[PDB]
Task: inverse folding
């Protein structure tokens, strides 16, 4: 129950439960498959 | 072939024609109307003299010269003596009215000058004394003569400083009030229709003025070479939808 | 009896909170409303009405004359006026727009700047108004000025010209109190050809200038105005 | 909502930027009437500029002070601040005043918050705990006279009792006699030659007199009352030019003589940046 | 939920979301169209 | 969810453990690519490492102090701590600063808690009860000057009044001018040759000046204000390397000269355990 | 008036609790979000990117 | 609710304003029995004069 | 919502909205019509 | 335990507020009402009865 009118006044947000490290761990242009050779 | 420019206003037994108008303003986009029952309080039936009060009265003329500061009239005061409008005014306890104001000033295509014509609802004036000095009655009831902002401070009178609208606000912002300019190069008249604006449904016509009409030169008058250095300004005003109520003995007012 | 716990902030008075209160006058009946022309709902409604700018600020005591921008006959190439666009300060500051902007911390949007000409009808003139977006200096000559937002104004039957300062900005809000990062540009005006008076006529002619906000405009985060203060409470 | 539409080159006979300001209108010209624009959206509603929001936060409207001390031998309680009254009004302290006078007529309910704090400027063993009793002395009702008169019985007059250090809060409906409160009034109370002019004769509402309920301790205690006012359910008509000069009096428009130029003079030319 | 009986005791009002500047910006008697000449 | 799958002997031409790190990727290698594993489940969600959780607890962001004393003859209230202001900011006290600067841009609502406690370091008969009034002096609004200026009327500026010893709490929406707050800014406010560099010119927001509402008692009372800040509704973009050296200034990245080696030297060889 | 009882812990400030508060800026409208590459949601996302180890610590 | 109805000139044999107070009644005479009135509404209920309200503070 | 068991403990009563002055203003035995003569 | 916040005005006594209170005499039975002529409901009922005006105030 929100007792207040504005959105800033609500409690903390709830877990992204998004999670996708590939923008950080695999930003390569041509896709690399694990097990296939790195450099062909 | 209708132009914004030519106009005719017929009200009662009097008509005005202008061949050089610049549209017309209707305050707050509302046209004068009578007092509806749902808004009524006083139980008295009101009197609506119609055409005998709703006609055009032309006040005496002013003279714009290079030194003019501006003039100020109050309503219904300015009309306190015009024909039957005025009688009704002194004889009823309460009255209510809207107006058509037509300010006139013609020159030639060699003159320059620009007047601001503005209507201010509830224009409470300031004392030039400062502090909490009041502005006596007579001073805020100049009648058809109006107040001449280039006249001298008097005692018990209001301040007449133009950059401050006679109340502590700047001339530049008067444009938030219904107004129209008369720019000799464009315009030769200004017309404003004023609906009745008050916090009560009907009021006293003598103890309270509900608008001040103000004509202020802003771009100084500049006449062609060796022209006479002045132009007359005329103000004609017509009560519209007037109603009077609570008839009796006839008010006696100071001075 | 229902168990409760009170949180931090209990008992505080926040002047901006909005809650219910007991009425001191139980059952009282207010006066009926009657109709009054002119109701205002948003300050955004009124900042779109234009008001005059005391552009000619060069006087020494407030005068009707600082609203008048003078024009000289026969000058060519030259500059009519210049100003930065800190709407919360300087020329803008006393205008209705300036005056309201000062109740808020941030503004964004387009401005409408218009000039009404008051010279004799038998005269003529062509002026250029230029808006210079943030990043360059106030233009120093028309050549410089004409490369940014500009309008050639031809003085005619139609007396006023409405220039718009379109919102040009990286950051989507600027501060109303003058700030650098957040600055908005300059506005200048120059003779495009020149003012020409008819015979039998002489002297200076003036332009009146107005400012109002486009429907575009946003103002946010209310605060107190530097435009009013006091040293002791007033009395009757 | 679009803030700007896309618009391209123009070579017309239809010129939206030439107008005649003499007419009194402000023609609704937009960036896209005079430059080439791209679409953009507003992303904004204008929520915080609603008049309810503008006049709806608490503002300090009054600071008064009363003291708790032995009234023995005091011939004039009112005069000893054994209690005080406030000829209620809003245009005294000004921050809020300039805000309200942007309008001619205004109608709203009021929510009052009253904070009371105590001071003991001279040697006390302790801080006592005082209860304040503020009560509404509308006009026609009698004025107390002493700090413990029959008046304080307040059998028909709303009164609130709270503790110094705490806050009291209650809300009063719109008590105006007309349909709106006049922010300005160019009239008199009657056609008298010397009667006062302005709003002081209209916006009448009597006063609200505070006192401490406690009898006196050995030391003296100064209690200073701050009244805050918040407008709720606001309705405002007829905008006016903002106040430029300083204020001098409650209820008159008067400004001080030899005031200073309110428009900032340029440091340079008209041509200066 | 109002806890109190009187209307004055309720919280602040809610946004007009009315907004119509034309009574202030265009109070002219004969309608002006943007783009058409101001004075005919 | 499985944390490890079962995997057995391998003799392949498909080697997941040989990669080329020059590419910039971190290939997702698992225990089961190089040893024989058994199934096991995660039993865990990673709840408490969510950025909302990481930045969502209150951190002390500021400690200031004001005193209640007779202002009689004080020529500079600000200077007597008759009140003070805090040119609001978050990178002053550091525990929270290192946490935020793990990201480049951050967007969140703030919840402030303000604790105020009083001290009476020299002989007092008692402890008085003071009410603090902290108010938001955004930038453009005027600065008070005395501890009881018209400014404190705060008719348009949010202010909270609470008691010393208590706590005040309210929450402010994300007030940034852009879409996010810059934790870093490699720019200037304009192309000036001597203008300052960094974020001090960006993350502008004026200040919040506190005062005691009470007049003075016979003794003096020190009130020390602690502001706590909790981010709610957090959004963070572009992770960066954590801060290694100590901080020297609000808003610049500068580290102190002749700082000490931040990597611990081995007590022994590279070969040491 | 509804009868209540307050429990132990009333008035405490726990830096880790998560509740509602009044907004100091009623009705204010925040700047629109635009898109920015790189959003992080969990610290678990970033500790999977490898970084260099100063293994040769002997200096 | 109407506070006053509209009423015009009268020239009757039916005079509501002449009564005999000796009877002990207060005859319910209204403005519209003796002047010409216009319609107006009450806009009011008499809430705050209820005895519960009068003795209830 | 009453939180208490006894009726005395409830808040103020609500407006009679009864209103009939005739027991006080017209307690006459034979009915008087306004407009008809008082004494016949 | 449900989390609460108290507002300004807590603990005040406003002589005009109207709320519930515990009964000191739980379960007591008031005397039956009997009929009494003359009940008044509104002060508006009684100000319509006319009374004499001391018009001749000159004594
Ligand atoms: C600023 C220009 C003009 C505009 O509005 C006003 C104005 C002036 C006065 C005014 O009155 C507010 C009503 C006050 C009455 C409230 C009752 C006080 C009280 C104490 C207790 C206990 N219970 O009630 C309301 C508005 N003046
Ligand atoms: C640490 C690196 C960068 C990142 O974020 C920030 C940063 C800096 C400042 C900032 O401002 C927070 C907003 C403060 C305004 C809140 C209003 C205060 C107040 C008092 C009262 C009473 N009402 O409101 C928010 C974020 N700096």
Result:
């Amino acid at each position: 129950i929100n007792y207040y009118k504005d959105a800033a006044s609500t409690s903390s947000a709830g877990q992204s439960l998004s999670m996708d490290p590939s923008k950080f761990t695999e930003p390569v242009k041509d896709l690399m498959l694990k097990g296939a050779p790195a450099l062909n | 072939g209708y132009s914004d420019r030519v106009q005719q206003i017929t009200l009662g037994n009097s008509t005005i024609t202008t061949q050089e108008a610049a549209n017309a303003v209707v305050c707050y986009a509302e046209w004068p109307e009578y007092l509806p029952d749902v808004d009524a309080s006083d139980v008295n039936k009101t009197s609506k003299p119609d055409t005998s009060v709703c006609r055009f009265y032309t006040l005496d003329s002013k003279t714009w010269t290079t030194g003019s500061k501006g003039w100020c009239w109050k309503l219904p005061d300015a009309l306190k003596d015009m024909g039957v409008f005025g009688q009704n005014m002194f004889f009823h306890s309460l009255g209510r009215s809207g107006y058509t104001v037509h300010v006139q000033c013609n020159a030639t295509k060699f003159h320059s000058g620009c007047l601001l014509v503005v209507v201010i609802p509830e224009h409470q004036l300031a004392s030039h004394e400062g502090g909490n000095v009041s502005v006596k009655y007579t001073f805020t009831h100049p009648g058809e003569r109006g107040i001449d902002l280039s006249s001298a401070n008097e005692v018990g009178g209001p301040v007449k400083d133009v950059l401050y609208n006679m109340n502590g606000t700047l001339l530049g912002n008067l444009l938030i009030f219904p107004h129209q300019f008369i720019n000799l190069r464009t315009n030769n008249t200004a017309t404003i229709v004023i609906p009745y604006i008050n916090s009560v449904p009907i009021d006293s016509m003598t103890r309270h003025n509900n608008v001040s009409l103000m004509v202020i030169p802003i771009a100084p008058l500049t006449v062609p070479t060796g022209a006479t250095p002045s132009l007359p300004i005329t103000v004609t005003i017509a009560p519209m939808c007037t109603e009077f109520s609570g008839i009796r003995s006839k008010s006696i007012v100071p001075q | 009896g229902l168990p409760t716990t009170t949180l931090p902030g209990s008992g505080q008075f926040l002047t901006t909170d909005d809650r219910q209160s007991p009425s001191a006058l139980p059952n009282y009946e207010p006066t009926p409303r009657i109709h009054i022309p002119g109701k205002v709902h948003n300050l955004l409604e009124i900042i779109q009405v234009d008001t005059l700018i005391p552009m000619n600020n060069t006087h020494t005591k407030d005068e009707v004359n600082s609203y008048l921008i003078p024009l000289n006959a026969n000058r060519q190439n030259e500059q009519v006026f210049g100003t930065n666009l800190f709407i919360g300060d300087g020329v803008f500051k006393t205008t209705l727009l300036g005056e309201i902007v000062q109740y808020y911390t941030h503004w964004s949007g387009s401005l409408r700047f218009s000039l009404m000409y008051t010279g004799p009808a038998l005269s003529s003139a062509k002026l250029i108004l230029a808006y210079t977006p943030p990043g360059a200096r106030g233009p120093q000559d028309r050549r410089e000025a004409m490369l940014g937002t500009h309008v050639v104004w031809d003085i005619g039957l139609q007396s006023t010209i409405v220039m718009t300062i379109p919102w040009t900005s990286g950051v989507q809000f600027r501060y109303t109190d003058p700030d650098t990062y957040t600055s908005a540009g300059f506005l200048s005006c120059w003779y495009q050809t020149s003012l020409i008076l008819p015979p039998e006529t002489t002297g200076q002619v003036y332009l009146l200038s107005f400012i109002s906000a486009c429907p575009d405009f946003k103002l946010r985060l209310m605060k107190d105005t530097q435009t009013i203060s006091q040293t002791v409470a007033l009395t009757e | 909502t679009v803030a700007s539409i896309s618009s391209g080159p123009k070579h017309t006979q239809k010129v939206p930027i030439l107008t005649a300001n003499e007419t009194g209108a402000t023609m609704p010209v937009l960036p896209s009437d005079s430059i080439e624009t791209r679409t953009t959206y507003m992303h904004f509603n204008g929520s915080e500029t609603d008049v309810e929001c503008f006049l709806g936060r608490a503002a300090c409207v009054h600071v008064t002070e009363i003291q708790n001390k032995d009234a023995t031998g005091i011939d004039n309680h009112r005069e000893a601040k054994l209690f005080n009254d406030w000829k209620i009004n809003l245009s005294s302290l000004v921050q809020l005043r300039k805000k309200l006078e942007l309008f001619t007529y205004v109608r709203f309910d009021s929510e009052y918050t009253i904070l009371a704090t105590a001071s003991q400027p001279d040697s006390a063993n302790y801080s006592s705990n005082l209860v304040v009793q503020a009560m509404y002395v509308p006009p026609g009702a009698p004025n107390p006279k002493e700090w413990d008169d029959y008046t304080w019985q307040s059998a028909s007059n709303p009164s609130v009792f709270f503790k110094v250090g705490d806050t009291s809060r209650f809300s009063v409906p719109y008590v105006g006699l007309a349909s709106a409160y006049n922010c300005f009034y160019d009239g008199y109370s009657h056609d008298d030659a010397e009667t006062q002019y302005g709003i002081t004769v209209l916006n009448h509402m009597g006063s609200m007199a505070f006192r401490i309920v406690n009898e006196h301790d050995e030391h003296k205690t100064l209690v200073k009352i701050r009244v805050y006012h918040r407008a709720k359910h606001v309705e405002a008509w007829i905008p006016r030019a903002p106040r430029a000069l300083p204020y001098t009096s409650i209820g008159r428009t008067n400004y001080p003589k030899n005031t200073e130029p309110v428009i900032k003079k340029r440091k340079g030319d008209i041509k200066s940046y």
Remarks:
- The first strand of chain G starts at residue 4 and ends at 6.
